[PDB]
Amino acid sequence: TYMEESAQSAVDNFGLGFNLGNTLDANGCGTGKPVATYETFWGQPETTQDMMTFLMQNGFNAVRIPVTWYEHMDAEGNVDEAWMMRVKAIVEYAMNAGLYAIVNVHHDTAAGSGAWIKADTDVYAATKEKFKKLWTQIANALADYDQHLLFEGYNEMLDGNNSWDEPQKASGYEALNNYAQDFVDAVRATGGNNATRNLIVNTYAAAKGENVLNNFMLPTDAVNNHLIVQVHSYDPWNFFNTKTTWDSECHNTLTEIFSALSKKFTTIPYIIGAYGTHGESDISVSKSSPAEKIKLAADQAADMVKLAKDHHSATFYWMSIFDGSDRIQPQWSLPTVVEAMQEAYNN
């Protein structure tokens, strides 16, 4: 049964969140393959009900489900039925487990080959109707799920130069803001539960610098309080390689980030939709990292979780805590990181 819930209520209920990363967002094997060829292409197992059940069983209340779509669309932009069914299936696993879930449009943005959604007015002109047709299909396919399911328009939209901090042209922000409006428009048009479903729109690059926040424009929505803004955080950049301890620089960096976010968005809720130790040369923590580096990861995660709580936000860990063959067991990959998160959330 669908029960309308405000965006802030949803965020307040997300609790500890997790990203099912490098899974349905994996891509690159080409078209015309069985669904599992995509889902396992970046070294994750096929997702099962047990994995979602495990998250709920262990103190997590929300899961972000990244999805990359471009190899699953025909020339007209129609989504392959096998692919849409699998997205539906993993969504249902999360719903069954009692979790909140987010479905997005993932490596259709950013620097990967195949990205086609870009913060560039010419790219926007060429792709706007394709983007709306995609969201119309996703919204229709997922329409009957209750308010625990949210839609996120796009992941990490960059300009045509893949500029990670800010677009090289100010009009890049216009394009982004227009995509965000088109996403909301297309979803709302499908009606039913989607008339009041909570929707998530991301900043440029999911970044949070002064210019990016000042040039973000929240879409107009005919219903009240059903929009959430999302940013990501791997800050201070490359700390996993340069630091042995989560020190005052690290702490102050995060406190200042949340201060800036809360002063920008006031009444509009926001989330940290992805965070972790991922730094230069995409190095990140694993269970074979030195103990000191695992502690560094735990301290980051605890700080992120408690600061988000203080700021009426919520957080979603990018991958590392529940990874690879550990998902099959199911067991945590990084139990000390999770213990720190749990302490931070429940106090």
Ligand X SMILES: OC[C@H]1O[C@@H](O[C@H]2[C@H](O)[C@@H](O)[C@H](O[C@H]3[C@H](O)[C@@H](O)[C@H](O[C@H]4[C@H](O)[C@@H](O)[C@H](O)O[C@@H]4CO)O[C@@H]3CO)O[C@@H]2CO)[C@H](O)[C@@H](O)[C@@H]1O
Residue 245 marked in a binding site: no
Which listed residue (235, 262, 268, 324) binds ligand X by CB under 6 A? 235
The annotation status of 266 as a binding-site residue, yes or no, is: yes
Among 209, 122, 111, CA closest to 158: 111
The residue among 165 and 343 lying less far from ligand X, judged by its C-beta, is 165
Shortest distance (Å) from residue 6 CB to Ca ion: 13
DSSP letter (8 states) at residue 43: S
Q: Site residues for ligand X, window 71-100 (CB under 6 A)? A: none
CB of 289 to ligand X, least distance (A): 19
Closest separation between CB of residue 59 and ligand X, Å?
Answer: 26
CA distance 101 to 67: 12
Contacts with Ca ion, residue ranges (CB under 5 A): 31, 80
Looking at the Cβ atoms of 196 and 300, the one nearer to ligand X is 300
Is 300 a residue that touches ligand X (CB under 6 A)? no
The residue among 17, 20, 94, 96 whose CA lies nearest residue 59 is 17
Which of 12/235 has CB closer to ligand X? 235
Residue 208 makes contact with ligand X by CB under 6 A: yes
Are 270 and 307 in contact by the 8 Å Cβ rule? The answer is: no
Is 257 among the residues that bind ligand X (CB under 6 A)? yes
Q: How far is CA 64 from CA 16, 133, 149, 162, 246, in A?
A: 11, 22, 10, 24, 26
Alpha carbon 337 to its chain centroid, in Å, reads: 20
Q: Is 23 annotated as a binding residue?
A: no
Using the minimum distance from each CB to ligand X, give the nearer residue, 39 or 166. 166
Considering beta carbons, is residue 31 or 346 the nearer one to Ca ion?
31
Among Ca ion, ligand X, none, partner that 80 touches (CB below 5 to 8 angstroms by kind): Ca ion
Q: Compare residues 144 and 165 and give the one whose CB is closer to ligand X.
A: 165
Of 66, 68, 80, 67, nearest to 32 by C-alpha is 80
Query: In the complex, what is the shortest distance from the CB of residue 53 to ligand X, in angstroms, rounded to a whole number?
Result: 30
Minimum distance between the CB of residue 210 and ligand X, rounded to whole angstroms? 6
Distances (CA, A) of 140 to 102, 187, 334: 15, 8, 37
Q: Closest by alpha carbon to 199, among 217, 183, 182, 178?
A: 183
Which does residue 256 touch among Ca ion, ligand X, none (CB within 5 to 8 A, set by kind)?
Answer: ligand X
Does residue 229 touch ligand X according to CB under 6 A?
A: no
Token pair, residue 315, equals 């957080």
Query: Among Ca ion, ligand X, none, what does residue 143 contact (CB within 5–8 Å per kind)?
Result: none
Q: Considering CB distances under 5 to 8 angstroms, the limit depending on partner class, which of Ca ion, ligand X, none binds residue 208?
A: ligand X
* Residue showing the smallest CB distance to Ca ion in the complex: 80
Rounded to 10°, the helix 171-189/121-141 angle is: 20
- Contacts (CB under 6 A) with ligand X, residues 154-173: 164-165
343-to-140, 170, 338 alpha-carbon distances in Å:
39, 42, 9
Q: Which stretch binds ligand X (CB under 6 A): 34-42, 113-121, 222-230, 232-240?
A: 232-240
Concatenate the DSSP letters of all residues of 166-211 into one string. S-SSTHHHHHHHHHHHHHHHHHHHT-GGGGT--EEEEPGGG---HH
The two tokens of residue 152 are: 């996120």
Q: Using CB under 6 A as the criterion, which residues of the chain lie in contact with ligand X when the complex forms?
A: 164-165, 208-209, 233-237, 253, 256-257, 260
